[PDB]
Amino acid sequence: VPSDYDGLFQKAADANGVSYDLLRKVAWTESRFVPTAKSKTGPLGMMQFTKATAKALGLRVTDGPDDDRLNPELAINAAAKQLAGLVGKFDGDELKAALAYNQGEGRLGNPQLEAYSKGDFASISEEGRNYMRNLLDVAKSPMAGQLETFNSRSTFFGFKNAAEAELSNSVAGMAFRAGRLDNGFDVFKDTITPTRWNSHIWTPEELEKIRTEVKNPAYINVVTGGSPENLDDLIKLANENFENDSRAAEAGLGAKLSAGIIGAGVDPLSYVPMVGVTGKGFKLINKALVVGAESAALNVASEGLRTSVAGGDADYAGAALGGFVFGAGMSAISDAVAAGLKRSKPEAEFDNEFIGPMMRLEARETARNANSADLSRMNTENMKFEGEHNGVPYEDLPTERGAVVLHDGSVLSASNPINPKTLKEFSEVDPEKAARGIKLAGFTEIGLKTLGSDDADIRRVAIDLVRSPTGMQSGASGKFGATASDIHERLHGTDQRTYNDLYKAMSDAMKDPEFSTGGAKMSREETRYTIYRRAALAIERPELQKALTPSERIVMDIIKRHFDTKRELMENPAIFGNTKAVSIFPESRHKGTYVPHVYDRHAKALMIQRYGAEGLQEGIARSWMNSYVSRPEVKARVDEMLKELHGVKEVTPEMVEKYAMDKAYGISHSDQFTNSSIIEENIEGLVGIENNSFLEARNLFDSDLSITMPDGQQFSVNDLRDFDMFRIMPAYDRRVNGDIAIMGSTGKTTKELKDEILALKAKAEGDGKKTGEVHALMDTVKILTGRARRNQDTVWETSLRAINDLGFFAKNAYMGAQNITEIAGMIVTGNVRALGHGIPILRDTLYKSKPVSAKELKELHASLFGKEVDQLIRPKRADIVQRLREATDTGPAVANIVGTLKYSTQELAARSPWTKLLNGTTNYLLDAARQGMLGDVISATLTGKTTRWEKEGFLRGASVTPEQMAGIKSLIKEHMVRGEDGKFTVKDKQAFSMDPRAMDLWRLADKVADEAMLRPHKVSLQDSHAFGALGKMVMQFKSFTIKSLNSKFLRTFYDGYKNNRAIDAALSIITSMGLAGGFYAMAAHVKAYALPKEKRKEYLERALDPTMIAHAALSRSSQLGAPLAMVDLVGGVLGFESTSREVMGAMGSNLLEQMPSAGFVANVGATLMNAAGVVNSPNKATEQDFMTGLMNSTKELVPNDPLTQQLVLKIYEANGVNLRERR
Amino acid sequence: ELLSKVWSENQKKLEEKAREKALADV
């Protein structure tokens, strides 16, 4: 069926909004898919028109071949514009538009159009009537029935066609004879119609009006009844709705559910969409389940929830209400599905899998709010426990699958991310993803090994770096300094606190109307990038700060304070114990906040595609010189540095030009200052521990001013830089904290310590014991400098340890942490069940324990390799990918070449309704579909087969020339190895990513993915046939999305309130979790084949079950637009994975504390620690820090809105659930 | 329109057949 022009038709339909099927079938009839068609009349083209249409309205502004030749993209786009104009001009009647297009208009057209208008199909010409008839299916018209009155239909009963046509007078014959299959369902035309207030991106004046006059901007998103005519009415309606809902909450659903969600048997499925409800007046005190009830808390700890961010107990309440609604509804869903299945097989008990956790969650929350007697706690008598994952004992319950019970009787269900049994088993059976990590050694073990004895030097370095917890030496005056370990722990703690501060500030910033209310301007990660970039630019140029909204102002203040503190610690690393510690900071006397200079790999790649190497270097140098000549402060500091460097009283401009060129060479001809996470991933040799990249990227110029390149287009060094403080601030912190620790503990730099340790190794090369000690010391240096790599799994194990500690001491925080973790587990397990039911490939092959086919294994190898290659070659900056996707549209190109007014990309961008409406699900599906396309293209190229995307039209959809595609083929052949089995490997990894053709490969895959897989509004089985394992998975996910949008609840909800934002949130959460689970399943099947034959069945059964797939989903969900990473908010210290005299010593020591943190009450919303606060901070993380980190980290997994929980629940209900089996 | 025409034609055929049956029984 496809004929190489499908992407062109799809884009020409999204732009100039018109039916894709209409344009495609017009191509069918007119030309039967040939670009130049020989016609006796004379018209020659894809759409077969010379006539006057051609010049017409289309050109005469550009050099046009026209009547002779037409560019196929231009021809299709112009014809699509004409058809859209006709369709609109004829109201929505596509058949009259098709008649006008085929028969023309005026000379013979208008009489036939009028004849159409009065019924009168007899007056319409025979050819036009046949043309309309062959367009009947794809075209929608009020006149379709009248034309029908003026066959490959699936048989209702009996034999096909004749049996039901010539006969079957009985009803079924009538139903068949009146059928008329449509084949014309458009999800955004029929199901989700873009309203006026969706898709409408605010102007600055509208944005300011909304910011000033709208109390809660989320009420802008709902459009109940008729659409308000003007923004003032929308604002009025939003405010009235907000006041009404705030008033209603006092007796609303929160208050009604505050007593007995599941003790009362509340069924959330029979519920109105509960839009206004934000969990608020929701304190679940179930009367009964409150046996004992002290009004006074036992300690000053406990009392309330110990979170330290403002708005706590309220976002927690929203998460709790959403989780209770979801869990009760999922229990109801499971019971109903069990009843439906018992109809078929009465002798099958099935398992609820939700009502146990939900009952215990109600009991815990009830006791938490009532302060006493958790009734969910089990009777621990006759329990031997035994079995410790991280020193936490547990008993497996035979009654509940997985679901261990803790020391106090607290029972953690399976799929609870923190329970020790699931964590342990996930560690034992984890698909390829298990790595070296930090399992080598920890600070406590290295202290015992190296502070132990045998050398004066080894012990000297150990005393400087590592601290002994308990030692036989017990040095009375071992060191009056911090030591590198303590500095590292202190810096980790302060960084974590400021990360939670930044997370809260960024959430508030990116909830503002610019990104949340109107039509979706940008993806979530792109809003995050824009806000971080605004903060960074305002930091560098303070005049931009008046342009920040108060929330972005808070964000910028947090980031500025963090970077100022880091600079202060590098400049004065003697602020710790060591007095001979001096200024690890690269270039002092440059007095200003240093936001790290890190340059995008792909920005440099683009600036090398033109102006290859010397061009980009000259551009960087010349922009720096623009800064130098423009601003006298830059000139002053650069002149001072050059005078000091060359020892000359005067500086000639040749000197500063040479300096700028030498510094720009480091960016242009080296990848040291780029993202380059992969080279840091390598650990051997201690080569990269020297030469911190963040500090060497420092220069005295300003990257702000732009220089025009030889083609006249403007480039500034800021265009290269990577903002977003999501990969940038954490990595900068890792490196600089390592450097600060090394200098504050040892007077020496990282380089000097590296050389001295290598000298010790070379000296004691003979002794095995000494060699092991030196290797432990090297491991300490790797941990300090951040080489390490803790992995994702430290999050849940750290949470388990901290929650155990809370259970010992802070009861209310303990129970709240259990509640939030249980809610996360139920969310993810419900997702696993529903999507295992719904998506076909998942249940049929990947969620099943049975091993897959050999061809299926090859497809899985291709898919996982495609994901890996995407990770290597994907542009990290969200701006780069958004502009790359938008710019390739015809509108931007035509405006850039012909237009006299500048316009802007993202203003002329066509944009799929999938992006405008339902943006988050769209981004997840683009990412996964592009990875699938990469895998398919690579596998086909290495195999030698020709992809469907090698064809000219889909290449024209991207900017892929004939030549570029051949270059892509050569690149894949050059850097990729075809394994003996389906296994795929890369050669040199780094060199492959450095190839310029890698960007062409990525662009090809991404644009093909968009055009073919995600852009169309229709999903079909034939569509799923073409793609590979990942492609089929994500097409079935897109089909699942469309099914959900057509579900009764979701359809009714959109009719009542519109509010595509809520549906987008729900479907994006579902898609994230499901793709995580699917990737886990594919990697598990691959690892199973990695095992020998007898072990494959046991391993697949053990590693492919709802608990482990659910734990993978929580661990590896993407969370694309998340401010900071979930590891950063809660992450253990790298080195720190794990009688009364020392007690009394610690007591008498802390008896004296008089730092301002102890004296003063903590700030509400922003610590804003300076160097004094960092130095005076404890190394151990306080329970407030852990608890706020847990709440922030689960804010991504566990949504705060009860409405999105209800929407996810109803999507699952319409989908169905597996229900386990037997026990 | 299509439903009306289909049901009308079907009803004509059914009434024809029923009339034949009734006249046969008489």
Tab-separated table of N, CA, C and O in Angstrom, chain A residues 906-965:
chain	number	residue	atom	x	y	z
A	906	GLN	N	9.074	27.611	15.141
A	906	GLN	CA	8.041	27.416	16.166
A	906	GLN	C	6.890	28.387	15.975
A	906	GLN	O	5.935	28.338	16.741
A	907	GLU	N	6.957	29.274	14.986
A	907	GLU	CA	5.801	30.061	14.576
A	907	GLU	C	5.250	29.552	13.255
A	907	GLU	O	4.036	29.588	13.041
A	908	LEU	N	6.116	29.091	12.358
A	908	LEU	CA	5.653	28.563	11.085
A	908	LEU	C	5.633	27.043	11.098
A	908	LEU	O	5.257	26.412	10.104
A	909	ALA	N	6.038	26.441	12.210
A	909	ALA	CA	6.048	24.992	12.325
A	909	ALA	C	4.637	24.432	12.238
A	909	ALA	O	3.716	24.921	12.894
A	910	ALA	N	4.478	23.387	11.428
A	910	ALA	CA	3.191	22.728	11.258
A	910	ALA	C	2.728	22.114	12.569
A	910	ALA	O	1.643	22.437	13.062
A	911	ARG	N	3.545	21.213	13.115
A	911	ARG	CA	3.328	20.571	14.408
A	911	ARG	C	2.149	19.613	14.354
A	911	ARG	O	1.030	20.005	14.015
A	912	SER	N	2.392	18.357	14.699
A	912	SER	CA	1.320	17.387	14.748
A	912	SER	C	0.342	17.754	15.857
A	912	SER	O	0.723	18.382	16.845
A	913	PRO	N	-0.932	17.393	15.708
A	913	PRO	CA	-1.843	17.517	16.850
A	913	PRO	C	-1.419	16.647	18.011
A	913	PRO	O	-1.837	16.892	19.146
A	914	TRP	N	-0.595	15.634	17.758
A	914	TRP	CA	-0.050	14.839	18.846
A	914	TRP	C	0.868	15.674	19.725
A	914	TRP	O	0.967	15.437	20.930
A	915	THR	N	1.583	16.630	19.139
A	915	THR	CA	2.433	17.481	19.958
A	915	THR	C	1.626	18.588	20.615
A	915	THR	O	1.755	18.823	21.820
A	916	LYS	N	0.785	19.271	19.838
A	916	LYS	CA	-0.036	20.341	20.388
A	916	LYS	C	-0.973	19.813	21.459
A	916	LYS	O	-1.113	20.411	22.529
A	917	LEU	N	-1.603	18.680	21.195
A	917	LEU	CA	-2.525	18.035	22.107
A	917	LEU	C	-1.855	16.748	22.555
A	917	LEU	O	-1.395	15.979	21.711
A	918	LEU	N	-1.804	16.498	23.863
A	918	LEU	CA	-1.136	15.305	24.396
A	918	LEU	C	0.364	15.315	24.097
A	918	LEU	O	0.885	14.449	23.395
A	919	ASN	N	1.066	16.302	24.657
A	919	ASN	CA	2.477	16.495	24.334
A	919	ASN	C	3.378	15.451	24.992
A	919	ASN	O	4.325	14.968	24.366
A	920	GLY	N	3.125	15.115	26.257
A	920	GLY	CA	4.035	14.223	26.966
A	920	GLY	C	4.060	12.818	26.395
A	920	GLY	O	5.130	12.235	26.177
A	921	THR	N	2.875	12.250	26.162
A	921	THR	CA	2.788	10.947	25.517
A	921	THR	C	3.484	10.982	24.171
A	921	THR	O	4.180	10.037	23.786
A	922	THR	N	3.313	12.088	23.454
A	922	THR	CA	3.947	12.270	22.161
A	922	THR	C	5.460	12.221	22.267
A	922	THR	O	6.123	11.604	21.433
A	923	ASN	N	6.030	12.877	23.278
A	923	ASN	CA	7.482	12.883	23.408
A	923	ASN	C	8.009	11.497	23.749
A	923	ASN	O	9.023	11.053	23.193
A	924	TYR	N	7.324	10.794	24.652
A	924	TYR	CA	7.735	9.428	24.965
A	924	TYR	C	7.690	8.546	23.724
A	924	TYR	O	8.618	7.763	23.463
A	925	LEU	N	6.622	8.670	22.937
A	925	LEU	CA	6.474	7.830	21.759
A	925	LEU	C	7.481	8.196	20.676
A	925	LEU	O	8.003	7.309	20.000
A	926	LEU	N	7.777	9.486	20.492
A	926	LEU	CA	8.856	9.854	19.577
A	926	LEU	C	10.177	9.246	19.991
A	926	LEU	O	10.901	8.706	19.152
A	927	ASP	N	10.532	9.350	21.271
A	927	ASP	CA	11.813	8.804	21.702
A	927	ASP	C	11.892	7.313	21.416
A	927	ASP	O	12.848	6.832	20.792
A	928	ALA	N	10.868	6.568	21.832
A	928	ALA	CA	10.916	5.120	21.661
A	928	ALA	C	10.843	4.725	20.189
A	928	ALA	O	11.523	3.787	19.757
A	929	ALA	N	10.038	5.437	19.397
A	929	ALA	CA	9.911	5.129	17.978
A	929	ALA	C	11.197	5.438	17.231
A	929	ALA	O	11.577	4.720	16.303
A	930	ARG	N	11.881	6.515	17.613
A	930	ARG	CA	13.154	6.835	16.988
A	930	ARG	C	14.201	5.789	17.328
A	930	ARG	O	15.004	5.407	16.472
A	931	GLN	N	14.217	5.319	18.576
A	931	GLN	CA	15.143	4.246	18.922
A	931	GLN	C	14.835	2.981	18.127
A	931	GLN	O	15.750	2.298	17.646
A	932	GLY	N	13.552	2.662	17.970
A	932	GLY	CA	13.183	1.515	17.156
A	932	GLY	C	13.604	1.663	15.708
A	932	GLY	O	14.107	0.718	15.099
A	933	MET	N	13.402	2.850	15.133
A	933	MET	CA	13.843	3.099	13.765
A	933	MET	C	15.352	3.005	13.634
A	933	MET	O	15.858	2.492	12.630
A	934	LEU	N	16.093	3.520	14.613
A	934	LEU	CA	17.543	3.386	14.569
A	934	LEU	C	17.945	1.923	14.553
A	934	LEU	O	18.775	1.510	13.735
A	935	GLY	N	17.358	1.125	15.443
A	935	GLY	CA	17.666	-0.294	15.455
A	935	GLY	C	17.327	-0.974	14.144
A	935	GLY	O	18.110	-1.772	13.629
A	936	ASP	N	16.157	-0.656	13.581
A	936	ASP	CA	15.748	-1.266	12.321
A	936	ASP	C	16.696	-0.900	11.189
A	936	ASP	O	17.108	-1.767	10.412
A	937	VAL	N	17.055	0.379	11.083
A	937	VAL	CA	17.942	0.813	10.008
A	937	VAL	C	19.312	0.171	10.156
A	937	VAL	O	19.896	-0.304	9.178
A	938	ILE	N	19.844	0.139	11.378
A	938	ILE	CA	21.166	-0.442	11.594
A	938	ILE	C	21.155	-1.928	11.260
A	938	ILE	O	22.059	-2.438	10.587
A	939	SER	N	20.133	-2.645	11.733
A	939	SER	CA	20.065	-4.079	11.486
A	939	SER	C	19.915	-4.375	10.003
A	939	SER	O	20.559	-5.291	9.480
A	940	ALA	N	19.067	-3.618	9.308
A	940	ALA	CA	18.890	-3.843	7.879
A	940	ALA	C	20.157	-3.510	7.106
A	940	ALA	O	20.516	-4.216	6.158
A	941	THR	N	20.847	-2.435	7.490
A	941	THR	CA	22.076	-2.064	6.802
A	941	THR	C	23.159	-3.115	6.992
A	941	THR	O	23.826	-3.507	6.028
A	942	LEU	N	23.347	-3.592	8.224
A	942	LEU	CA	24.355	-4.621	8.455
A	942	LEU	C	23.965	-5.930	7.787
A	942	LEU	O	24.830	-6.670	7.304
A	943	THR	N	22.669	-6.235	7.752
A	943	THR	CA	22.206	-7.439	7.074
A	943	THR	C	22.305	-7.303	5.561
A	943	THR	O	22.428	-8.309	4.854
A	944	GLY	N	22.264	-6.078	5.048
A	944	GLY	CA	22.280	-5.833	3.624
A	944	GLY	C	20.926	-5.529	3.024
A	944	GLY	O	20.860	-5.104	1.865
A	945	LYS	N	19.849	-5.729	3.778
A	945	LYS	CA	18.514	-5.475	3.259
A	945	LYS	C	18.262	-3.980	3.128
A	945	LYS	O	18.868	-3.164	3.826
A	946	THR	N	17.367	-3.624	2.214
A	946	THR	CA	17.033	-2.229	1.972
A	946	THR	C	15.811	-1.829	2.787
A	946	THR	O	14.748	-2.445	2.664
A	947	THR	N	15.956	-0.795	3.608
A	947	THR	CA	14.840	-0.360	4.430
A	947	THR	C	13.778	0.316	3.575
A	947	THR	O	14.046	0.833	2.488
A	948	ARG	N	12.556	0.317	4.093
A	948	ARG	CA	11.479	1.085	3.491
A	948	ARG	C	11.756	2.581	3.520
A	948	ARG	O	11.131	3.333	2.765
A	949	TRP	N	12.691	3.022	4.356
A	949	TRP	CA	13.012	4.430	4.516
A	949	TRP	C	14.186	4.869	3.653
A	949	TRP	O	14.498	6.062	3.615
A	950	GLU	N	14.838	3.935	2.954
A	950	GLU	CA	15.834	4.306	1.954
A	950	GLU	C	15.198	5.038	0.782
A	950	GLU	O	15.896	5.716	0.020
A	951	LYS	N	13.886	4.904	0.616
A	951	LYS	CA	13.216	5.439	-0.558
A	951	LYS	C	13.199	6.964	-0.527
A	951	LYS	O	13.300	7.589	0.530
A	952	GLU	N	13.050	7.558	-1.715
A	952	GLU	CA	13.339	8.979	-1.891
A	952	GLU	C	12.405	9.865	-1.078
A	952	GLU	O	12.843	10.865	-0.502
A	953	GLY	N	11.115	9.535	-1.039
A	953	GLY	CA	10.157	10.443	-0.428
A	953	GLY	C	10.383	10.646	1.058
A	953	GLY	O	10.379	11.777	1.548
A	954	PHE	N	10.590	9.554	1.797
A	954	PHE	CA	10.805	9.682	3.234
A	954	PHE	C	12.121	10.387	3.531
A	954	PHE	O	12.235	11.113	4.525
A	955	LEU	N	13.125	10.193	2.676
A	955	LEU	CA	14.346	10.977	2.797
A	955	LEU	C	14.077	12.456	2.559
A	955	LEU	O	14.665	13.309	3.233
A	956	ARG	N	13.202	12.775	1.604
A	956	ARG	CA	12.827	14.165	1.365
A	956	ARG	C	12.079	14.746	2.558
A	956	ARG	O	12.142	15.955	2.810
A	957	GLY	N	11.361	13.900	3.298
A	957	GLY	CA	10.712	14.366	4.515
A	957	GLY	C	11.702	14.907	5.527
A	957	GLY	O	11.418	15.875	6.235
A	958	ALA	N	12.862	14.272	5.631
A	958	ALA	CA	13.996	14.825	6.353
A	958	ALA	C	14.889	15.570	5.361
A	958	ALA	O	14.502	15.835	4.221
A	959	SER	N	16.046	15.996	5.843
A	959	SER	CA	16.960	16.725	4.988
A	959	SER	C	17.995	15.738	4.526
A	959	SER	O	19.173	16.068	4.416
A	960	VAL	N	17.561	14.515	4.252
A	960	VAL	CA	18.512	13.494	3.872
A	960	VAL	C	18.618	13.422	2.369
A	960	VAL	O	17.670	13.042	1.687
A	961	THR	N	19.773	13.805	1.844
A	961	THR	CA	19.993	13.700	0.415
A	961	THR	C	20.239	12.233	0.097
A	961	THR	O	20.636	11.465	0.972
A	962	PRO	N	19.991	11.827	-1.154
A	962	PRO	CA	20.588	10.603	-1.688
A	962	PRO	C	21.976	10.329	-1.130
A	962	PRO	O	22.221	9.232	-0.628
A	963	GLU	N	22.877	11.303	-1.222
A	963	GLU	CA	24.241	11.118	-0.739
A	963	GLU	C	24.318	10.885	0.759
A	963	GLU	O	25.090	10.049	1.217
A	964	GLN	N	23.527	11.624	1.525
A	964	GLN	CA	23.577	11.493	2.972
A	964	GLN	C	23.189	10.091	3.402
A	964	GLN	O	23.805	9.530	4.300
A	965	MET	N	22.164	9.528	2.771
A	965	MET	CA	21.728	8.179	3.118
A	965	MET	C	22.819	7.156	2.826
A	965	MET	O	23.035	6.219	3.606
